[PDB]
Design a protein around this ligand. Structure first.
Ligand SMILES: *[C@@H]1O[C@H](CO[C@@H]2O[C@@H](C)[C@@H](O)[C@@H](O)[C@@H]2O)[C@@H](O[C@@H]2O[C@H](CO)[C@@H](O[C@@H]3O[C@H](CO[C@H]4O[C@H](CO)[C@@H](O)[C@H](O)[C@@H]4O[C@@H]4O[C@H](CO)[C@@H](O)[C@H](O)[C@H]4NC(C)=O)[C@@H](O)[C@H](O[C@H]4O[C@H](CO)[C@@H](O)[C@H](O)[C@@H]4O[C@@H]4O[C@H](CO)[C@@H](O)[C@H](O)[C@H]4NC(C)=O)[C@@H]3O)[C@H](O)[C@H]2NC(C)=O)[C@H](O)[C@H]1NC(C)=O
Ligand SMILES: *[C@@H]1O[C@H](CO[C@@H]2O[C@@H](C)[C@@H](O)[C@@H](O)[C@@H]2O)[C@@H](O[C@@H]2O[C@H](CO)[C@@H](O[C@@H]3O[C@H](CO[C@H]4O[C@H](CO)[C@@H](O)[C@H](O)[C@@H]4O[C@@H]4O[C@H](CO)[C@@H](O)[C@H](O)[C@H]4NC(C)=O)[C@@H](O)[C@H](O[C@H]4O[C@H](CO)[C@@H](O)[C@H](O)[C@@H]4O[C@@H]4O[C@H](CO)[C@@H](O)[C@H](O)[C@H]4NC(C)=O)[C@@H]3O)[C@H](O)[C@H]2NC(C)=O)[C@H](O)[C@H]1NC(C)=O
Lengths: 209, 209
């Protein structure tokens, strides 16, 4: 039971947000200490690449080694459907262990986004919750965030994706705001980024009417 | 050697008079060399003997798996009693034990708010009614719908999500027909949680105006 390889995809935030840089990460574990120097080979649609940043053999608590390599991807390359292979070689193993990862397959379904105001029985309280329903999207990789009067917010929570009755997912975002600022005529904005949208972004608005 | 895992009753079982809640003791990794296992059950440090120990399962790993189920009283589980499963073998240097009890913390009753379908959703034949349930501790809860008294089969609920103040929240979504929403049919979101009166509350919705 020697080396074990695990390949992880980039984070949806990174793939969807232009200014970021998404990464694909190869993790080798249980590298035992007789022969602990491991060599990485990276392939993109079967073409070798060499621009990954391989880390040095970190130690572990179970007196095993854990080596990591990070390959930079370009946004459109990941969302075009290319496939990323990590082939890992170590002196103590029969034939190099390999793993591939690529974008979740299935025909992309675009999310419908809706904004829900506070219920009637919540106005008695000091703070009110605005709701953002995001439903009908596939794949499940999604980013949702709020912003009020042009500039961001931090005070919000988003449920994990929930599989719906028809192979699509949905989620809810919640934003706690002060009833004073809600009923004094301020606009809030729910914004979602997902691969199937126009410019990978759309946003709905909410404001007392 | 073996491994013991003690699992608590399901929340539905505890919250519902009709159901019967159970604590489940699982033992894994029991070698075929000495494969006979036995259970002692203690409740608040008092030995019970009314458990239902099953025969010893076989497993693919070339190991065995034994299970023992103990019935509990609804009120007993909700009073904070502690449930100990003491497992002894022959290849065990000494008996292993696990204990389990209610999630400790100060119970906080949930707030239930019903939400109608958004402005821009009403162009479709199908319409989403949403239950917001917030500010409850612990996370163990059971949410279900009904319309005009009759149970619904077609709703999806979020996992519990931790909020900024240690309490949890969740959202439940029932999909019904535009026709039957516009038809002044009342729907009802009901929630069962230990911190409520009668471990139950219900808030309803319909085309109010
Ligand atoms: C020695 O120690 C090392 C490290 O120590 C570890 O960390 C410290 C904190 C300790 O306290 C301990 O917690 C722990 O020991 C151990 O290294 C760990 O080893 C395990 C297995 O040996 C790794 O595997 C994990 O497995 C699950 C699920 O993944 C697949 O593999 C399972 C096989 O065991 C299988 O049962 C699953 O079903 C699943 O199978 C996959 O299924 C899909 C289906 O869609 C299929 O397509 C795949 O082909 C199939 N793959 C198969 C079969 O191989 C999971 O728990 C692990 O991923 C995450 O695990 C943790 C949860 O987040 C987290 O620790 C990890 O970081 C990882 O999270 C991701 O990390 C990357 C970068 O690291 C990051 O970019 C991501 O954002 C992040 N994601 C999230 C959500 O956080 C993993 O798949 C563990 O990964 C591995 N952990 C580490 C840190 O190396 C070692 O086992 C010990 N050895 C011994 C002998 O004890
Ligand atoms: C032989 O095979 C058996 C079984 O085969 C298994 O299933 C088949 C399908 C295979 O294909 C494989 O998938 C798999 O091998 C193997 O036996 C299994 O072995 C593992 C570990 O050896 C057991 O692990 C699981 O453990 C989690 C929690 O893990 C605890 O320990 C971790 C470290 O070991 C630690 O990191 C965790 O945090 C956790 O530790 C606890 O943490 C809490 C934190 O609050 C703390 O309070 C505790 O004090 C602390 N305690 C300890 C000791 O660490 C456990 O939660 C899992 O239980 C449920 O979830 C599984 C799915 O993830 C599910 O399969 C289980 O059946 C179980 O399901 C529950 O069942 C009850 C009643 O039956 C029901 O009421 C629940 O609703 C239900 N819930 C769910 C979600 O299913 C899990 O147990 C496995 O239990 C164990 N046996 C199984 C899976 O039957 C064995 O390894 C194989 N042999 C070899 C050599 O490998």
């Amino acid at each position: 039971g020697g080396p074990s390889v695990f390949l992880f995809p980039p984070k949806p935030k990174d793939t969807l947000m232009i200014s970021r840089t998404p990464e694909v990460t190869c993790v080798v574990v249980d590298v035992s200490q007789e022969e602990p120097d491991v060599k990485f080979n990276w392939y993109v649609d079967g073409v070798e690449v060499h621009n990954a940043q391989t880390k040095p053999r970190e130690e572990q608590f179970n007196s095993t080694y854990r080596v990591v390599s990070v390959l930079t991807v370009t946004h459109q390359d990941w969302l075009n459907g290319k496939e990323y292979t990590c082939k890992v070689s170590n002196k103590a193993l029969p034939a190099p262990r390999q793993k591939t990862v690529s974008k979740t397959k299935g025909q992309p379904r675009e999310p419908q986004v809706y904004t829900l105001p506070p219920p009637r029985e919540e106005l008695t309280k000091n703070q009110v919750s605005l709701t953002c329903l995001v439903k009908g999207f596939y794949p499940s990789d999604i980013v949702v965030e709020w912003a009020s009067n042009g500039q961001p917010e931090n005070t919000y929570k988003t449920t994990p994706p929930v599989l719906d009755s028809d192979g699509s997912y949905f989620l809810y975002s919640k934003l706690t705001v002060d009833k004073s600022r809600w009923q004094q005529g301020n606009t809030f904005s729910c914004s979602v980024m997902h691969e199937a949208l126009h410019n990978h972004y759309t946003q709905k608005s909410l404001s007392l009417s």
